[PDB]
Amino acid sequence: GSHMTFVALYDYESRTETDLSFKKGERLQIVNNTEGDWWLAHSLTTGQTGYIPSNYVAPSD
Amino acid sequence: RRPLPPLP
Ligand code: NI
Structure with missing residues (x-):
């Protein structure tokens, strides 16, 4: 839901x-x-936050 | 703009 x-x-x-x-x-x-292009993300692995290039990621379970 | 990086 988010x-x-x-x-x-x-x-x-x-x-x-x-x-x-x-x-x-x-x-x-x-x-x-x-x-749209650059997304604010948070790593579930490392706990760090920042902008990422959206073309480097894909939806995941 | 900030272009996205090319893919490896
Ligand atoms: Ni959700």
């Missing part, structure tokens, strides 16, 4: 102060997808 669970398809290294770095296979909760 859960938006995605899995990282590849690694992504942060390159701004607001990006989230993640490893392939991490599960993420999508907090805000307002921008």
